[PDB]
RNA sequence: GAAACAUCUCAGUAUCGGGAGGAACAGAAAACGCAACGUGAUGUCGUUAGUAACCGCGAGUGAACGCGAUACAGCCCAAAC
RNA sequence: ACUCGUACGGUCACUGAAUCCUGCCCAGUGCAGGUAUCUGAACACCUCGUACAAGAGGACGAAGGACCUGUCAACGGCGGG
RNA sequence: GCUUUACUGCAGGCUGUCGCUGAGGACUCUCACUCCGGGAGGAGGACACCGAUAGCCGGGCA
């Protein structure tokens with residue numbers, strides 16, 4: 001039979017329809033008055049959280065982050081630039097808003113490590129994402145056969161080096177064949193052409 | 195070129211800033227709940243460095259020493275009342291609804307409870323004209339008919355220090371002293387006397403503007419100089 | 432007044448001093464920032480890639 | 488100059504002389520789906536677009552004859568080398 | 580550089596911000612597509628090749644599959660119950 | 661920032677104490693107001709096209725422009741016969 | 742370096758359109774959102790702000 005989780009999932013397929021439309025209209029009013037990074041006890045999308053790796057355990061933290069909507073907040077050139085490099089308005093950043101959210105969260109919690117994240121909607125001026133962070137130093141996690149990999153030294157600051165799922169997708173690493181010639185094993189090894 | 199003088203202004207540097215640390219008080223109306231039982235005695239009449247007009251020092255019934263925007267004919271010993279049921283006397287503050295038509299008023303609020311925005315300079319006044327349940331039409335010092343909320347407070351009488359503009363400065367030194375008390379860079383060098391690099395009207399073998407002086411509203415800062423969006427120019431016609 | 436020799440006489444102000452962090456006479460006693468190591472500006476030591484030739 | 492609307496001349500299709508009809512080549516409308524149209528969309532970004540930033544040039548004082556010679560029996564057309572003519576009017 | 584120059588080129592170079600390790604990153608196919616009755620995670624080396632592809636179709640720019648090597652290693656969740 | 665400011669304000673320009681004065685010109689350029697009609701992009705909408713799409717056309721039409729008016733202590737002009 | 746009715750572009754301003762954005766070719770409302778108010782509450786209101794795109798102006802700048 002269907003899980004209770006499948007209903008949270010099916011509601012989030014259309015966040016502008018049904019009971020969720022009313023819920024988000026109410027929640028966003030409280031969210032707009034909240035901070036940049038707000039730690040929350042329980043995830044808004046349980047299915048997605050659990051699907052991404054969350055467990056109702058010690059050392060597993062969730063936090064909602066709001067990042068501004070739109071393109072790059074670019075300053076115009078103060079020196080000589082050829083016509084091609086004179087733009088301000090149409091320039092967009094190479095990192096997506098989800099990745100900016102994950103980084104801001106990881107900085108608010110220096111000891112924790114980013115596991116994953118997901119979208120929880122937007123209004124006209126900003127976007128909200130909930131980031132699942134993990135405590136690599138808590139024994140409740142060092143003994144977890146499903147999460148203890150994040151405790152390794154090489155997993156330190158994993159988000160800033162693009163090792164998150166959102167990191168790997170934004171780096172163009174999804175495709176294993178055609179189209180990923182300049183992306184795998186890294187953008188840097190391929191001369192920054194990805 | 196180089197940024198024009200009006201552009202250096204917005205950066206808010208020392209040269210363009212007002213000497214706020216030498217200023218006395220932010221002349222706002224008192225916060226009363228409802229009851230009118232707030233009145234006070236005028237203790238002193240001081241000079242306000244920010245507006246070059248006098249300001250009255252009032253001590254209220256509850257023990258609050260605040261500087262208020264002084265109208266004409268207000269002295270030491272005089273009692274001033276602030277509230278809804280206040281007396282229609284010069285120097286009293288009450289909402290526009292309670293003030294009768296045809297009475298000169300000053301320190302008028304824009305949105306009820308802001309503390310006064312309009313008619314604050316030396317000798318000027320706002321004229322209260324029409325009454326309604328919804329709107330109070332006030333004629334501001336510029337001659338404009340401002341439709342306001344009747345719950346907007348205002349002080350009865352014309353502002354003190356009238357006729358200041360009547361006497362000439364005579365000499366540059368007097369202007370210097372007035373300007374040292376304001377948020378203004380003075381003296382003024384004409385753009386026509388500058389280099390092309392410094393102003394749109396700069397350059398030339400003789401002094402005259404480049405293009406015509408009447409500039410469009412859509413003009414960017416650095417080009418918006420001369421006669422900004424002029425409907426007309428000159429005296430005749 | 433000339434910008435050269437006669438303007439050098441007014442120079443009796445102390446700005447750059449011995450730094451607590453690096454030991455260089457670059458701690459600006461008015462800015463409270465070291466021009467050499469960045470003490471007072473950053474926790475990280477001031478270093479730049481242009482302090483050496485590009486391929487070195 | 489004056490040009491006869493219908494006249495006897497060679498047909499490279501029929502391989503014999505037939506009565507041809509002369510018509511001025513009417514410009515066929517563009518689809519906007521050729522490679523050059525797709526390149527105009529792709530190679531245009533911030534600043535100058537190179538070749539796509541150029542505007543159409545001038546005109547020669549006199550253009551050549553742009554004509555179609557349509558066969559009377561087989562109904563197929565052929566193109567010929569044009570000649571400089573300030574005006575080209577047809578007879579009948 | 581294009582014997583000017585704007586796209587292009589120099590170059591994702593210089594330089595700047597953030598961060599890990601002793602190495603990093605990548606990685607067990609929603610792959611490939613010598614189309615196959617075929618291959619079988621990933622880096623890297625040789626080659627494929629200055630080939631395909633791009634380009635005021637100018638100057639210039641420029642892969643990959645495959646192959647020969649190196650080394651080889653596959654696994655864990657979410658959900659169902 | 662102006663601004664502990666509010667039109668007797670303060671911003672932007674021109675001229676340059678006082679005294680006597682400051683003519684004519686709105687065609688061009690600028691600014692501003694208006695505008696039946698004309699022109700005027702994209703989205704959505706309608707027709708054609710495509711089992712879809714590219715694409716072609718139509719309808720509607722903002723500011724702007726055409727057009728009209730105001731304005732020279734606005735740029736300036738004040739001749740030849 | 743500087744100028745402009747040089748070429749090409751880039752900011753900026755104006756304007757339409759989409760998102761935020763809701764209820765009953767012009768209109769009413771209040772629930773988002775904005776502002777005023779210490780507060781109660783008041784003004785405004787699906788507009789404005791902001792994100793995106795389109796047309797016009799655009800030596801202010803390259």
Ligand SMILES: [Cl-]
Pocket residue numbers: 106112113114156157158159160
């Ligand atoms: Cl992290």
Ligand SMILES: [Cl-]
Pocket residue numbers: 372
């Ligand atoms: Cl003054």
Ligand SMILES: [Cl-]
Pocket residue numbers: 511551552553554575
């Ligand atoms: Cl012809």
Ligand SMILES: [Cl-]
Pocket residue numbers: 618
């Ligand atoms: Cl194969």
Ligand SMILES: [K+]
Pocket residue numbers: 082
């Ligand atoms: K260049």
Ligand SMILES: [Mg+2]
Pocket residue numbers: 185186189604
């Ligand atoms: Mg590598």
Ligand SMILES: [Mg+2]
Pocket residue numbers: 219220221222
């Ligand atoms: Mg005040």
Ligand SMILES: [Mg+2]
Pocket residue numbers: none
């Ligand atoms: Mg004056």
Ligand SMILES: [Mg+2]
Pocket residue numbers: 209373374375376378
């Ligand atoms: Mg000063």
Ligand SMILES: [Mg+2]
Pocket residue numbers: 382383384
């Ligand atoms: Mg002057």
Ligand SMILES: [Mg+2]
Pocket residue numbers: 387388389
């Ligand atoms: Mg000079």
Ligand SMILES: [Mg+2]
Pocket residue numbers: none
């Ligand atoms: Mg000179």
Ligand SMILES: [Mg+2]
Pocket residue numbers: 195390391392393394
């Ligand atoms: Mg200039």
Ligand SMILES: [Mg+2]
Pocket residue numbers: 401
């Ligand atoms: Mg002169």
Ligand SMILES: [Mg+2]
Pocket residue numbers: 401402
């Ligand atoms: Mg002059």
Ligand SMILES: [Mg+2]
Pocket residue numbers: 580581
């Ligand atoms: Mg060259």
